[PDB]
Ligand binder design. Structure first.
Ligand SMILES: *[C@@H](CC(=O)OCC)[C@H](C[C@@H]1CCNC1=O)NC(=O)[C@@H](CC(=O)[C@@H](NC(=O)c1cc(C)on1)C(C)C)Cc1ccc(F)cc1
Ligand SMILES: *[C@@H](CC(=O)OCC)[C@H](C[C@@H]1CCNC1=O)NC(=O)[C@@H](CC(=O)[C@@H](NC(=O)c1cc(C)on1)C(C)C)Cc1ccc(F)cc1
Ligand SMILES: [Cl-]
Ligand SMILES: [Mg+2]
Ligand SMILES: [Mg+2]
Lengths: 184, 181
């Protein structure tokens, strides 16, 4: 609900977010640093994506799992483009973030530049999501809709995670942690 | 953009509802007492569905200027016991222009969504949906069906109500203080 959180969110989406289509559907994508970006794992990007209606090559993809192989529901993508993202790694936490007030930001054809005050975010942990055991889920209560996956969950100076699932009035993000961007 | 969003979220929580008529689903802003506003195109009947509940309409006034020109707003007096928080002090005497506005929507398609639409210009006259219409405010963003009744706001100001557009251009009817007496 906070002004500064929305101010932060809008600036973040303007600088680093895009609309991406894969063979599996349309998503919000967040650039992280250099040419590295993130999508929900179920976006299932191939060797070419559509980024703001433009064909972009994918040079590497990394589907994130924990040390025991459990799904984290995020895929990191290295893009064949010459433009670089603003390095936003400093806005990513070392561990799953909780906040009193978060904003979920969506950038797709269905929801072009929409911001939703989702209220409190709780570190929920384990969830069987779409039939897949998944960890490091953040939960929040708002009226969820199809097409919001990839939405960026934020608060002032904080990128918490990426929207990946939900049902009815409950939404879940995969926590977006800083160490995910280290080879190890 | 921050202060505009903060003002907008509080306004919607307190004064906005979702309304269904034969002509679709709308965001509806309550103004004071039992008086609310809808786009004229909503064409409310003697009853409306407000947050999924049947609510009687006691009076409906389709606003026109002194020469009968469409303003694209209908004021409705609702048969409800609850009074709206009085927000008339946030309404200007004339059409407002700002560098940064937020458009706020609350429907089943767009439940509690806020859009940074940037600059708002007093465009004036427009032939909208075939009807000559005045006091149009214009802003540039990717417009969508189901956003009518959306509340256009800036820091400490309610500017207008979304009534139309096409492609990447949206229009609000200016919400002027004198409309409410
Ligand atoms: C986003 C995907 C999308 O629409 O992109 C365009 C192709 C979508 C968002 C949810 C739909 C309804 N509300 C949402 O927030 N995500 C999905 O559809 C994932 C699957 C789910 O969310 C399931 N939900 C649950 O399992 C669930 C469990 C609980 C307690 O709450 N929800 C569906 C039954 C809706 C996609 C997905 C994610 C991860 C996977 F391993 C497989 C599939
Ligand atoms: C909201 C009402 C609704 O029922 O949802 C759509 C079915 C809707 C919003 C616009 C739809 C697309 N973009 C929008 O912002 N409003 C309308 O559909 C009105 C009609 C229009 O907006 C027309 N647009 C124009 O005439 C126009 C002209 C210019 C320069 O830019 N746009 C349509 C061609 C989209 C409803 C309306 C208003 C007044 C009337 F007299 C009749 C109908
Ligand atoms: Cl009545
Ligand atoms: Mg193909
Ligand atoms: Mg400007």
């Amino acid at each position: 609900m906070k002004g500064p959180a929305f101010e932060f969110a809008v600036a973040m989406m303007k600088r680093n977010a895009s609309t991406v289509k894969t063979e599996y559907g349309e998503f919000t994508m967040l650039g992280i640093y250099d040419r590295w970006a993130v999508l929900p794992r179920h976006a299932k990007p191939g060797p070419t994506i559509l980024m703001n209606d433009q064909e972009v090559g994918v040079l590497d993809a990394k589907e994130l799992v924990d040390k025991d192989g459990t799904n984290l529901e995020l895929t990191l993508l290295k893009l064949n483009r010459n433009e670089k993202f603003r390095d936003i790694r400093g806005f990513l936490a070392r561990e799953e973030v909780e906040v009193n007030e978060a904003v979920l930001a969506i950038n797709t054809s269905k929801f072009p530049n929409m911001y939703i005050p989702v209220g409190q975010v709780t570190d929920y942990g384990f969830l069987n999501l779409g039939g897949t055991p998944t960890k490091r889920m953040l939960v929040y209560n708002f009226p969820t809709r199809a097409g919001q996956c990839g939405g960026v969950l934020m608060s002032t100076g904080k990128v918490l995670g990426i929207h990946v699932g939900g049902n009815g009035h409950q939404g879940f993000s995969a926590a977006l942690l800083r160490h995910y961007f280290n080879e190890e």
